[PDB]
Design a binder for this molecule. Structure first.
Ligand SMILES: NS(=O)(=O)c1cc2c(cc1Cl)N[C@H]([C@H]1C[C@H]3C=C[C@@H]1C3)NS2(=O)=O
Ligand SMILES: NS(=O)(=O)c1cc2c(cc1Cl)N[C@H]([C@H]1C[C@H]3C=C[C@@H]1C3)NS2(=O)=O
Ligand SMILES: NS(=O)(=O)c1cc2c(cc1Cl)N[C@H]([C@H]1C[C@H]3C=C[C@@H]1C3)NS2(=O)=O
Ligand SMILES: NS(=O)(=O)c1cc2c(cc1Cl)N[C@H]([C@H]1C[C@H]3C=C[C@@H]1C3)NS2(=O)=O
Ligand SMILES: N[C@@H](CCC(=O)O)C(=O)O
Ligand SMILES: N[C@@H](CCC(=O)O)C(=O)O
Ligand SMILES: N[C@@H](CCC(=O)O)C(=O)O
Ligand SMILES: N[C@@H](CCC(=O)O)C(=O)O
Lengths: 270, 260, 260, 270
């Protein structure tokens, strides 16, 4: 029985191939997550069919309805069997699905438009108006936001740290809305906001987008927290233990190392 | 019903209290893992008593006898119910005990004494002038033993075919041997231990290059035990509340007995 | 019995002199390969007639029809008895024709228009700004097609999925494309042709990096032919006597119409 | 039927392992040739055992008696089945044995003791008294020899180049004899001759010995010849064609190059 693998359209995890008009099957998509799924199927022998969520969301809880949505939502109700995608392991998600061991470390970072090189002997130096989350919260000239129905927004909502609570209170009462519906949308907002928008996205995607052309964006400060991506699986499913074992084996053999190297650094430029 | 907690005497995870002679119970222990165990007990709601494993071993398999030693052996054979300790998550361990989510990330790092002629691990592998080794019955010797990348196999072969013995009984012994080798012996250990040692007096050691791989420490539980899910949820809650970062800052950066 | 000698019009291997309209027979051809064929005939003691393959193809298999083209096809199907030409020795060719000892070492090289921004092949593969291709129906394209190294697979995949066609019909066409691309196109070709081109006017092309691999040119004969051993012995004798070195110096460095 | 492999004791081709006192079989040797033979057996399946020639010579035809010796000699008379060794493909050797395609390229080079760095602003300049073969043959202060019963001595024996003829005429009338019995003997002679002895050997061994400590020897000039190493096989044997095919598919792609780089660079003591 072929099981359905749900995934999100997010570079470089899964990107549509250029010649995807005539290709049919699992060959339409390329990236980190397709190779991860191939290695998972090479460890334990099973047939998989890639799919993309229609709503295009990672997964969250809707207000006052207590209904899961996104990848997590459709994995809970049983229309998907395994989620090999950059899904952030969180306490709220672990209560409804099973998570494997993290296959990629990450953290919340800050994305701002790259300032022009300054000159005052005749050396160029890099000066930025934002250097950490504290100064970003204190200032008001630069707006900042997160991705709707994601993990960073959830983290800021329930955060008890004073600075993160201040940032979330600003975000909730921000007119117009600073939350975007896609990572690419937020990155484009940063690009054409003339440095007046700051995108709080994941460290991996931030580094990948920084490493690619036209590389007009930069990452300031450090990671706000430490988290990881885990291959999700419905509670009480036969695939949980084999998937965890496969992830552990792939981490020990360093396959994840080479996949990250060839999907984040090899194809980067500038 | 008190819960037996096995752990190893490793700094800054578990230390001995300065006045532990006049102290009994769990109050004679301190460190990152003691605070972690206290937080886990508070969240889950159980009474626990901290115990040190009889042999200072993290856990491995002996010479073709299929017997687990150290904390892993303590958990497998029912001598303990949980292990809050710097236990690395590995394939050979997960098959015999249940691991929680990694509460602290780490990697493998090279420690040398204070031009940096060693740089990355490739130069250390190509050059046989400076000796290097690992901790026996740990998660690094077995990592090099089971590796397949040519550089790691080369280093493991040099380790096994080394005269005299290069593996150290304790990580403190390795630190001391690095210190009194006048920059001739290098030590391979976890990045967190390397940072803690290089940040402590006399600060004569340092970490060179980057992490050879990426792993993490997880709370270990006997296979098929009722505590696995509660401690996993507790670890996730602690990470989401940012108290794991608070504990790491307290035991790694709050004191900082060095100039940096 | 005149022996038919197939060869390709490649410089400085075979050239049509300067006034070949007034010349007939073998006297209208000149180059390294013409001199090599003359020496081979002198050593073995046979009369030969130099002929140019009808299609400017070195040799390959067509689209799943199991038909050899070019000089290799000219030799397999009995149209010729020997091929004194810059024919690279490859696994697929040796199974159908008999190769002699390599009379001239070679390698795959990268040439760009006149500190190179790419230099090594890894940087060229990583950067998609500059296009790169090979000679069609040759040996470099089949080397990239049959390669298993990750970088070479990436380059081959970029070559096949390139709009418009990045391959060239002739090495001269590739050189012209490199000259007219204003540094936007890099040609992948043999090291010997690269050096010859860069040692000729107007000297606007230069070779970057090292050599991707090491190969050689051999004298090819039909499988199970009586001429294989004599030509192998003649090639060995010429190599030992320095005849090949003298010919290479004459046709690569003696003229040298370049500033270096 | 298990065939025997004849090989010379040369580095980094065949070196006795450190723990070779108790090891038995093919595990007593390490180097280039042991992996070459292993890959040969893997590509075309056969059983092989490693043997070393008793006389310790590469092979040459002695005059008068007209009896071959060395690896070539013992391959001719049928006491060995294959010579997976750094055997130079020679015209006289191809008249009695079968040679495969060259797996390694090489040339005849000059080895001299490294002089001390010049003092004179405060830059160190590398100046040597010999930079080619013409100036080596034009002087008499520095002696130069070759390896007895090898390919370089045979090349100098029947060379019609004026410079090489002068070198051979000097060598044939050198008292005491400038010919050495092994590569190690010639290297030691160069090292402890205080720069008065020059060694002519293959470029591969010269580069390898230059790359390792104490690296007190240097290679001057370019390669005199262009020659290769071929896996020898008795004339008319049924293993010649499979051996040649195995050599070809081994040289195809990065396998032979990988082995050469791993054996010539990991000894990077200098
Ligand atoms: N370098 S990376 O971010 O792509 C990355 C990150 C991680 C990897 C592997 C890689 Cl390649 N494996 C570890 C896993 C291995 C075992 C120890 C921790 C988990 C279970 N998680 S991780 O520390 O989140
Ligand atoms: N900064 S740190 O090393 O003390 C650290 C490291 C890590 C933390 C939390 C902290 Cl504070 N949580 C993550 C866990 C949280 C959820 C996502 C990945 C695992 C499950 N593991 S981690 O990436 O190994
Ligand atoms: N200098 S060169 O490229 O013209 C060149 C290159 C080579 C020459 C001779 C010359 Cl002059 N001979 C060797 C041959 C001689 C014997 C040893 C290897 C083959 C058989 N092949 S080679 O290494 O491909
Ligand atoms: N780089 S090297 O000297 O180790 C080296 C040298 C040579 C290799 C392969 C390597 Cl790795 N293969 C070629 C062979 C391949 C085919 C073309 C020429 C012969 C038949 N001979 S070579 O040009 O003598
Ligand atoms: N990976 C996140 C979404 C990305 C983000 O919010 O930055 C999640 O699983 O919810
Ligand atoms: N902490 C590791 C051992 C430390 C080391 O090997 O450096 C373990 O749990 O096995
Ligand atoms: N000389 C090659 C073709 C030229 C090339 O590929 O560069 C051959 O004989 O196949
Ligand atoms: N490889 C040479 C020996 C080395 C030398 O004489 O330079 C041979 O087979 O004869």
């Amino acid at each position: 029985k072929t099981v359905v693998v749900t995934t999100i359209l997010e570079s470089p995890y899964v990107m549509m191939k250029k010649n995807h008009e005539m290709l049919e099957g699992n060959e339409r998509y390329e990236g980190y997550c397709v190779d991860l799924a191939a290695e998972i199927a090479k460890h334990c022998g099973f047939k998989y069919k890639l799919t993309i969520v229609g709503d295009g969301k990672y997964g969250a809880r809707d207000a006052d309805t207590k209904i899961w949505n996104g990848m997590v939502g459709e994995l809970v109700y049983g229309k998907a069997d395994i989620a090999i995608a950059p899904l952030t392991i969180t306490l709220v998600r672990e209560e409804v699905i099973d998570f494997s061991k993290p296959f990629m470390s990450l953290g919340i970072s800050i994305m701002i438009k790259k300032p022009q090189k300054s000159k005052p002997l005749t050396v160029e130096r890099m000066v930025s108006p934002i250097e950490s989350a504290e100064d970003l919260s204190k200032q008001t000239e630069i707006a900042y936001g997160t991705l709707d129905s994601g993990s960073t927004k959830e983290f800021f909502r329930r955060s008890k740290i004073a600075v993160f609570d201040k940032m979330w209170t600003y975000m909730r009462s921000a007119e117009p809305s600073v939350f975007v519906r896609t990572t690419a949308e937020g990155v484009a907002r940063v690009r054409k906001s003339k440095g007046k928008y700051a995108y709080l996205l994941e460290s991996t995607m931030n580094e990948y987008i920084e490493q690619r052309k036209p590389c007009d964006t930069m990452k300031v400060g450090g990671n706000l927290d430490s988290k990881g991506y885990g291959i999700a699986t419905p509670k009480g499913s036969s695939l949980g233990t084999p998937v965890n074992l496969a992830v552990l084996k792939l981490s020990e053999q360093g396959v994840l190392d080479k996949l990250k190297n060839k999907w984040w650094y090899d194809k980067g430029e500038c």
